[PDB]
Amino acid sequence: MGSIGIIIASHGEFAAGIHQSGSMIFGEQEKVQVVTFMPNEGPDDLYAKFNNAVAAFDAEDEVLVLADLWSGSPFNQASRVMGENPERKFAIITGLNLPMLIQAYTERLMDAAAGVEKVAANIIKEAKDGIKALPEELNP
Amino acid sequence: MGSIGIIIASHGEFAAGIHQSGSMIFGEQEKVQVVTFMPNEGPDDLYAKFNNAVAAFDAEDEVLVLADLWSGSPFNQASRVMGENPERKFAIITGLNLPMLIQAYTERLMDAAAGVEKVAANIIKEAKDGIKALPEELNP
């Protein structure tokens, strides 16, 4: 049964700031957790934050992690928590940007019961498609 | 000679937060300005922030704006400033993410003579390529 909990994760306050961007553009949202990794912190503090974020969702919810980068402690600890909970469906998407977050909120509204693995493909596509340049000739 | 000044621009505190992410991974970076657009500000406030950010660079510097969202207010006021300073080389890339910012920093280190029109293609490429998922079956 059910829903998708979203965890926004980053080095530094990035994840908190883009969570604000999203609430201005999209409005308030349920079942969103923010995990920041600050300079006075180590990997085990981050491990605790992820476990605490997952426990804030209902036991039936699938989990979508939107992470800053495919490297470093935020990504590594998200992957660890994913691998320690094989009875729970997880997806991690790296390269967090605002089109990605908007599309994640929309896919939840539209199609949350299809699962995190189904909705990820179009979240990825819109995140990439929203990277565009001016002047137009600079685009691939 | 001139080099590239970077403006990181967003709705809300996103831009300040990812600037912090960048400093945790890439140290202190010269000629980087942050432009945030907060819930209690309007377009004329924003326009002034962009003009002040551009004034922090040297007259011969080129300007690279990394913006959160295509056709958003940060993007629109950046485009306006670009059109008002036609004697300055300018580029705008939307879909701001941490791979994008990392590559922009790398480009300036490798070749301070490369202008914003030359470095844009690899910055866009790495910004898109950095968007990937686990499980890996969601990837191409």
Side-chain angles (χ1 to χ4, degrees), chain A residues 1-4 31 60-62 108 111-115:
Chain A
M1 158 271 162
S3 322
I4 294 173
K31 295 186 167 182
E60 303 78 12
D61 298 345
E62 306 194 357
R108 278 208 305 197
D111 200 31

Short mmCIF file of all heavy atoms in Angstrom, two decimals, chain A residues 1-4 31 60-62 108 111-115:
data_model
loop_
_atom_site.label_atom_id
_atom_site.label_comp_id
_atom_site.label_asym_id
_atom_site.label_seq_id
_atom_site.Cartn_x
_atom_site.Cartn_y
_atom_site.Cartn_z
N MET A 1 0.81 -1.26 0.00
CA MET A 1 0.00 0.00 0.00
C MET A 1 0.83 1.29 0.00
O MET A 1 1.75 1.45 0.80
CB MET A 1 -0.93 0.02 1.23
CG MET A 1 -1.40 1.41 1.66
SD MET A 1 -0.28 2.21 2.83
CE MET A 1 -0.77 3.92 2.69
N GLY A 2 0.50 2.21 -0.91
CA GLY A 2 0.61 3.60 -0.53
C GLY A 2 1.46 4.62 -1.26
O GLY A 2 1.37 4.86 -2.48
N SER A 3 2.27 5.29 -0.44
CA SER A 3 2.82 6.60 -0.71
C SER A 3 4.34 6.51 -0.85
O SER A 3 4.93 5.44 -0.74
CB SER A 3 2.44 7.55 0.43
OG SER A 3 1.11 7.28 0.86
N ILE A 4 4.94 7.67 -1.08
CA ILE A 4 6.38 7.79 -1.28
C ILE A 4 6.87 8.90 -0.37
O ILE A 4 6.38 10.03 -0.44
CB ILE A 4 6.72 8.10 -2.75
CG1 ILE A 4 6.35 6.93 -3.65
CG2 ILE A 4 8.22 8.49 -2.91
CD1 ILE A 4 6.49 7.22 -5.16
N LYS A 31 5.45 14.49 3.98
CA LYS A 31 6.39 13.38 3.82
C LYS A 31 7.60 13.81 3.01
O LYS A 31 7.97 13.18 2.02
CB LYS A 31 5.71 12.17 3.18
CG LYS A 31 4.63 11.56 4.07
CD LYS A 31 4.04 10.29 3.55
CE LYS A 31 3.23 9.63 4.69
NZ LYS A 31 2.66 8.35 4.29
N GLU A 60 4.83 1.46 5.41
CA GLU A 60 4.49 0.98 4.08
C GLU A 60 5.05 1.86 2.96
O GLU A 60 5.18 1.38 1.84
CB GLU A 60 2.96 0.86 3.94
CG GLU A 60 2.28 -0.05 4.99
CD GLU A 60 2.11 0.62 6.36
OE1 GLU A 60 2.31 1.85 6.47
OE2 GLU A 60 1.78 -0.10 7.33
N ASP A 61 5.39 3.11 3.26
CA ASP A 61 5.88 4.05 2.26
C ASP A 61 7.17 3.58 1.60
O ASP A 61 8.09 3.09 2.27
CB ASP A 61 6.10 5.41 2.92
CG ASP A 61 4.84 5.98 3.48
OD1 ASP A 61 3.76 5.47 3.11
OD2 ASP A 61 4.91 6.94 4.28
N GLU A 62 7.26 3.76 0.27
CA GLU A 62 8.53 3.62 -0.45
C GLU A 62 9.33 4.93 -0.34
O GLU A 62 8.78 6.00 -0.03
CB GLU A 62 8.28 3.23 -1.91
CG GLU A 62 7.42 1.97 -2.07
CD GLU A 62 7.41 1.36 -3.46
OE1 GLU A 62 8.04 1.91 -4.40
OE2 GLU A 62 6.78 0.29 -3.62
N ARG A 108 4.51 12.20 -7.56
CA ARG A 108 3.80 11.70 -6.38
C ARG A 108 2.30 11.96 -6.52
O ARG A 108 1.49 11.06 -6.31
CB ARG A 108 4.31 12.34 -5.10
CG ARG A 108 5.54 11.74 -4.52
CD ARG A 108 5.57 11.96 -2.99
NE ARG A 108 5.42 13.36 -2.61
CZ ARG A 108 5.73 13.84 -1.41
NH1 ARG A 108 6.21 13.03 -0.48
NH2 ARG A 108 5.56 15.13 -1.13
N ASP A 111 0.93 9.56 -9.58
CA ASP A 111 1.21 8.17 -9.86
C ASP A 111 1.99 7.51 -8.72
O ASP A 111 2.69 6.52 -8.95
CB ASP A 111 1.99 8.09 -11.18
CG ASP A 111 1.94 6.73 -11.82
OD1 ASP A 111 0.92 6.01 -11.66
OD2 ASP A 111 2.93 6.38 -12.51
N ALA A 112 1.84 8.01 -7.49
CA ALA A 112 2.58 7.47 -6.35
C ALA A 112 2.36 5.97 -6.18
O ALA A 112 3.28 5.28 -5.74
CB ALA A 112 2.21 8.17 -5.05
N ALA A 113 1.17 5.45 -6.49
CA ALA A 113 0.94 4.02 -6.25
C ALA A 113 1.69 3.11 -7.22
O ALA A 113 1.74 1.89 -6.99
CB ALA A 113 -0.57 3.70 -6.28
N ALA A 114 2.30 3.64 -8.28
CA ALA A 114 3.14 2.83 -9.17
C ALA A 114 4.51 2.48 -8.58
O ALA A 114 5.19 1.60 -9.12
CB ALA A 114 3.32 3.55 -10.50
N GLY A 115 4.96 3.16 -7.55
CA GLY A 115 6.22 2.81 -6.90
C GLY A 115 7.35 3.76 -7.28
O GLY A 115 7.34 4.40 -8.34
#
